[model samples]
Target: VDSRVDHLFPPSLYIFVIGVGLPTNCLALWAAYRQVRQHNELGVYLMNLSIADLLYICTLPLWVDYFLHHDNWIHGPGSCKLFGFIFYSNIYISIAFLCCISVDRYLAVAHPLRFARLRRVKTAVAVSSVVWATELGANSAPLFHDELFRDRYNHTFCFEKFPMERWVAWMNLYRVFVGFLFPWALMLLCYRGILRAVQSSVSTERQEKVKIKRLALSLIAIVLVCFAPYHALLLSRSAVYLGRPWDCGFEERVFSAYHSSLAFTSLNCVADPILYCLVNEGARSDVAKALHNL
Candidate 1:
């Protein structure tokens, strides 16, 4: 439904997230734990990404209750800002991890030995630490402002980037550029080079070509489908607010779209697990074997 924000849609989406995301990412954590102990190259990023999703998933209950009870946040502004920081932090964290995975793939596939040391376990941990610190650090603006919680008709609304003040608008534009657009560009470039390398040697084996094709396409699909709408809308919304000849009507008309697109952002949590399940190939059997044992 292409309607405005409401108690119904957000709660429904969060419920879906909690139901699906919780179990999937929990298993992702387990599988990733197994991988990390074995020093699997990609598992460190998977574990970090799952941790981000799990933290994000926990925040969903607060949001679900808020929206289900008519979009009111009863907690204090401090709690609101903290949880809101977690919420936004997850987006960038996921983007960073996803981008890290692309770079990992590019190195593992494109030039495996030249950066063999970089693909080692310690390097993965170092990269993961760096991403967590920077992504969480840069997303602290919402936490700094006390106005993140809005009181309306005796109800407090949490974490709305509305009314489009200059700073907030600029902040949003910055977020879109760094979080979404930059990651998208980097991922595409990584995948592009991977494609070339794979295709160059693809004639050696058809299976490898298919492997390369599936992964590159799946990653691009996930990013575009899950992230493109929200950030793209954010880009437009921020540009409109930042551009001259401001129009309240424009924001008013598309306000619901922003919130709706936000649902899709939560959706990446679900998508990531699916990516692990489907793309990793080995993880799927690991999950199955673990399931059998349990």
Candidate 2:
């Protein structure tokens, strides 16, 4: 069998990645739930964000189980598409909520007086509803191209088997737009403006203001560190249709590098909860004290 047609799943890494993220995200979700019920508006968004991340991580064990059994999926093709769709969709939804969290924090610190009105639980719930709707619509693109549970030879494969390669390309482009470019730009803007506001606010307590600044910077770091590379590689793939030049000698090498780079995006699930603990009010002390005892 040609290597190009070889199995596309990454079992070992996927298992490890999902396994590590699940517990952490689960804990974060629990924390957010407690915080939100206390009327911590920021916690409202965080809870929704953690839920999306945790749900995605929950499916990881199934993939790991399949990989442990020699990568042969008994779930069938419908499952394959379902898993692929959920996995990819969750990526965008997670990013969207991250953007929301960044913006939420920025508004909270930059304009403390106004933050109260804007950061209500009802408002946060509405925003979360929109985020989920958008993700569902975007990820359902695969449905147009293929139905559930496709059988390939003896094995069942899940992803779309579109006859027109361009369909896949277009889907990638759409994802690049919604998932990466737009969200990234918004995050940068939100963080920058928040930092500027913090620097200019003399009325705000210096210590608290500095904490807010650190939080915004941390969110920005999380976005760039885990996600930027994946988008760069996804963009590189566009060279084929975007009239850009491709590197002949490095084509296979580049693709291989990107192929592996995707796993890094999963790091966001783990990285996010850590960021939340570091930045969320009182989380740092709690987590630190717990760690010290252990």
Candidate 3:
């Protein structure tokens, strides 16, 4: 019964998360394209971010297909590694881009008069390009140093081929810090400052300031609530990898239960479109239009 519950529920959640994220991200990408017409620097980042999400989501159906079956991976090793690389790379790139957006917004809205030099399309493009390169470097680290394949017992089949020791543990720790923690902290600080600045601004600009604050806060909240648990789980795994186990009683059971629970983090992909909608006016309008067309 326990085994059946694990198999059925986890895979079902995986399928649902991926199934929903793909189309939403595609629509987001399409809307982001319209924003590119205006050449708004923020719009460009938003578009590319959606592109990353869409690419990440493209691998979801493959995951769902594998999961819904008997848990065997019909996909080859190379394809499996490539899928993992692209999916994680997409996540790293999206977070980097989100951090960039937060900083850019803070500069433009929080310190508009003093941050004149930052409002350049070239600057935004260059920064975003650097972020993309960094994400590629980080995500591809596993591919160059180790191999990602599959693990199968008599009845259990899973997709990570790396060793359970330092390789997987440390790499995931790096992800926890670089991929999630650092950027989230930076975004938190930026949004907090922006919110405070908005409150103190003059009445003439208060409306715009309030709107930007709300947007920043919403994006920040989503990142905190959605991604934080995932990162914390990874870090906990890292701790366990280092031989620091939770207590061996109910505490153990609780942690064990929640360990597998981390898989649900993929659902963030589905809800992330809301952040895109809040930040990009053009995307909002396009989503409305697309819904109307539907």
Candidate 4:
């Protein structure tokens, strides 16, 4: 029997995200490109982040198609692997770039004088390049790893089946550690450092302090709300799939939660532009001016 939760939820959720995220990211990217031309460091990070999100967003339609057809994949195996590769690459790349943004902000506020030279546009560009390279390496396995398979219904599916081997366990651990936990740790450290530095500055205005707190909280919320559950489910599913004792009902529930939370993770594409770019007053003004010129 087909699970309604897995088959129905992704298509509806993806359609909504595509409608809103696609345009929002395009506008954000336009504004970010202008900033990049002006040699803004934060702009460099935002631009890269938007690029990653757009790559991920571009693959959503294929996923929507897959889900709408009750998990049957008409696309070739190459396309399936390509979709998985792009999807996983962007998720981690976006997270890594967001971490880079946090570090940049922390340096600007925390050790401004000492880290001045390291805060240059060139540094940001180099860091972004490294992030892209690292993600490409990290996510490359899926391309080689996934194989097309037919389910009991004799419908072709992609990325849903994997041999539960020791390598799968290792991969799960790597994803949990590198993709999710490490970034969250770095973000927490950077934001805490930034908050401490800001609070100690007697010259800083009260409103400025409040803004810093709000930004920190918002970033934390994004990580928790969008990413935490997905990775948690991933870990749990891996455990259960790796010979943990489980029944049919429990397996069904985990499978549903795991797939559903994946859609929630894509919501970050919608939130990233707003949180990372549009929240900046300068970025907002740039977007407004760009819109006016159009």
For candidate 2, the per-residue lDDT at 93 reads: 85
Off by over 4 Å in 4: 1-4, 162-166, 243-250
Q: How many pairs of residues in model 1 come into backbone collision?
A: 0
Residues 1-294, candidate 3, lDDT per residue (tens digit)?
A: 012233565567777777777777777766766665666667667766877777867776666666566555676666766786775567678888778878887787777788665666677778777878877876676775545333444323334432244477778888888888898899899889878876776675767876776776777787766677767766775676567433233223434334345456666677676667635675677778978997
Q: What is the C-alpha lDDT of each candidate?
A: 0.80, 0.70, 0.67, 0.80
Model 3 clash pairs? none
In model 2, the runs with Cα more than 4 Å from the true position are: 1-10, 65-74, 147-157, 160-164, 203-214, 241-253, 278-281, 284-294
Per-model RMSD to reference: 2.8, 4.5, 4.0, 2.2
Evaluate model 3: give its lDDT.
Answer: 0.67
Q: For model 2, state the Cα shift of residue 146 in Å.
A: 1.7
lDDT tens digits, residue span 1-294, model 4: 234457777778888888888888998889878877887788788889999989999988888888788777888878887887787668899889889888888888877778777777898889889889978987676666657566565556567653344565668778888998898899999999988888788988999999879988898788889888888877876777566533344455566677788878888899988886678898889889988998
Question: Per-residue alpha-carbon lDDT of model 1 for 152-173, expressed as tens digits?
Answer: 4444667774566666777888
Cα error, residue 160 of model 4, in Å, equals: 1.5
Error of 4 at 65 (Å): 0.5
How much lDDT does candidate 4 score? 0.80
